[PDB]
Amino acid sequence: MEDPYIWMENLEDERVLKIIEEENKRFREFIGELSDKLFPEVWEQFSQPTIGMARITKKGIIASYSEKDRVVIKWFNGDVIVDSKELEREVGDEVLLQGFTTDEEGEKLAYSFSIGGADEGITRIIDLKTGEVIEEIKPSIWNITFLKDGYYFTRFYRKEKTPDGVNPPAARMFWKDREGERMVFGEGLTSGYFMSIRKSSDGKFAIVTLTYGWNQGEVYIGPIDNPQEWKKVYSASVPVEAIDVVNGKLYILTKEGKGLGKIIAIKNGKIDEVIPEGEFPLEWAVIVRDKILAGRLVHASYKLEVYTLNGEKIKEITFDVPGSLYPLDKDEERVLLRYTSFTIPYRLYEFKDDLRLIEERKVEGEFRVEEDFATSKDGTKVHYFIVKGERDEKRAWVFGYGGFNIALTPMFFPQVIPFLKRGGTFIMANLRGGSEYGEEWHRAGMRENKQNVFDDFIAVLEKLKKEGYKVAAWGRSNGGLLVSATLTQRPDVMDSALIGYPVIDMLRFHKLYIGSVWIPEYGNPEDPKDREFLLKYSPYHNVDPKKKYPPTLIYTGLHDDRVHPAHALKFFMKLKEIGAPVYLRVETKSGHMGASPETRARELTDLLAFVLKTLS
Ligand SMILES: [Cl-]
Ligand SMILES: [Cl-]
């Protein structure tokens, strides 16, 4: 099938580079002054201390933080262990710090980073008392689980074949100790299988979870020191999460059945429900002491539920402000949870028998978090969050995603704060295709149902318009598709459009970078039956010259390795063809944002600047 802009898939074509150069200039002249004036306000919010991961050891908590241009790993209220700045001088390059873990004893720490925004990374294992690098592994490994004098770990094969000769993408599990390294699990597994391992709370069992896309899950358990005796004990036609093994009994969180999440247990092959499916999703569950601590997702924010090991509900905990809440780590006694919301970068909580707050960073101001519902084409209620400042200039910045079983739950958007301060309202919409209401909610936005997602977003945008708001619609990656499709269908419901790192060409998405992995979500363009519903919304095929379009910003990054910039370039050329007020920003500086904040903060400042200028 001919494509007039196929040459744009070659990012080294001189025609492509000319366009990128031209449009970055035009965009900079367009928001450059405003962006330079707002940058300090954005930078202030972006760069403040933000926790990443945390770990429990016998010696105390170890946590990572971002602040400004550096990232550190430190003893909680204690010594810095790893400093991204120290690292950069040692290796003489920009470094992104990915994750870390430790041993139970708090004497060994493993952390992974990437030199100069390399697509490859590094793993170092260090001694926590002296700080000596015990080991340095290249490429980086994952899921390090210390035992005795060594550890299990997983490798994810991206470019290379597996040792047993299987093509990527693939995963394999290894054991490493003084005598050396050997593969312990995953031999013969075809491409697409992923694995992870965790210990039981008592340290006696390996719990190994195996996953193939959305439609297969397997659980294995056995003696932590003996992979020869690891046995499959559960099979499911969806990925499930193994929680723990306690007193001969394996606990699993599964979205089998209606798809909302329940906890089952297996003992000697018999399967019992522990906590049956409820009205709202059960997103995670952990066992601590003799209790089950469960994260319940009620209209896309978290309430905390505490149960006995037998599934009798003991207590319920809600939060003052709707938030996202996730388990970071656990030991036998306690779990650490990270909370986040629109005006709360983070809270660090400790759960032992009850919930206790041990750290908080919040943005000061009289901010309100409200919630409402819009009604979609087919009657579906579309929940959304509303964030407001003290002032109301009737200007709304509306964010959605809608896909891939991702719930949109409260989180901190640094560039929205100055917006709220200027009378703006931030809206986060809970569209179909997400996990907000279970696997059925997700399925209701996949393949032929993808139009439902756009209908839900339209319903929110149109509600805001009727209420008198000026409206800027914003989304990234599958969320870029969201705004792009909505723009070509109902440009009349937005006064501004922001399209981030989008998927656009729905007949060729599967031919660029990793896009084939999205086939179960969107459908398969080689099949005419799927093309039939794909072409009904594909933005690349559905630009309407008869329509009037609002100011539109498409933004991407020249060196993104997941969502090919050609989507953005092609949609930009299509809008150019009809003289639409469209802009294109292509980030050229390398790497992402984890420990290289200024490039990312500028990008976000550019978005804020575009909203402020185009809605006025
Ligand atoms: Cl973004
Ligand atoms: Cl980015």
The closest ligand to the CA of 606 turns out to be 1
Residues in contact with 179: Cβ distance below 8 Å, sequence separation at least 6, in sequence order: none
Kindly state the tokens that stand for 398.
């509306």
The closest ligand to the CA of 605 turns out to be 1
Residue spans in the chain of domains classed CATH 3.40.50.1820: 1-48+363-616
Domain 1-48+363-616 has CATH 1.10.20.10: no
Ligand 1 centre from 558 Cα, in Å? 14
Assign residue 186 a region (left: φ > 0; alpha: ψ between -120 and 50; beta: otherwise). Answer: left
Q: How many helices (H) and strands (E) are present in the chain, helices listed first?
A: 10, 36
Write down the residue that tokens 């170890």 correspond to. Answer: 62
What is the rounded distance in angstroms from the CA atom of residue 221 to the CA atom of residue 388? 49
Angle between helices 450-466 and 478-489 (to 10 degrees): 60
Query: For residue 330, what are the β-bridge partners?
Result: 335
CA distances from 422 to 391, 397, 416, 428, 608 (A): 7, 12, 10, 18, 11
Burial of 278 (0-12, 13-18, 19+ CB in 10 A): middle
Ligand 2 centre from 560 Cα, in Å? 8
Ligand 2 centre from 604 Cα, in Å? 9
Ligand 2 centre from 112 Cα, in Å? 21
Ligand 2 centre from 433 Cα, in Å? 23
Residues in contact with 272: Cβ distance below 8 Å, sequence separation at least 6, in sequence order: 264, 265, 266
The closest ligand to the CA of 474 turns out to be 1
Angle between helices 597-614 and 14-46 (to 10 degrees): 90
Resolution (Å) of this entry: 1.9
Ligand 2 centre from 600 Cα, in Å? 6
Burial 405-420 (b: 16+ CB within 10 A, else e): bebbbbebbbbbbbbb
DSSP secondary structure letter of residue 78: S
Contact in structure between 106 and 128 (CB atoms under 8 Å):
yes
What is the rounded distance in angstroms from the CA atom of residue 376 to the CA atom of residue 288? 41
Residues in contact with 131: Cβ distance below 8 Å, sequence separation at least 6, in sequence order: 81
Kindly state the tokens that stand for 471.
């409206």
Phi, psi of 406 (to 5 degrees): -100, 115
CB atoms closer than 10 angstroms to residue 399: 22
CB atoms closer than 10 angstroms to residue 212: 17
Closest listed residue to residue 30, CA positions, set 498, 605, 610: 610
Phi, psi of 602 (to 5 degrees): -65, -45
Assign residue 468 a region (left: φ > 0; alpha: ψ between -120 and 50; beta: otherwise). Answer: left
Query: For residue 586, what are the β-bridge partners?
Result: 556
What is the rounded distance in angstroms from the CA atom of residue 315 to the CA atom of residue 98? 35
What is the rounded distance in angstroms from the CA atom of residue 291 to the CA atom of residue 309? 5
| Integer-rounded Cα radius of gyration of the chain | 25
Ligand 2 centre from 601 Cα, in Å? 9
Kindly state the tokens that stand for 505.
């060409």
Three-class DSSP category at 197: strand
DSSP secondary structure letter of residue 544: -
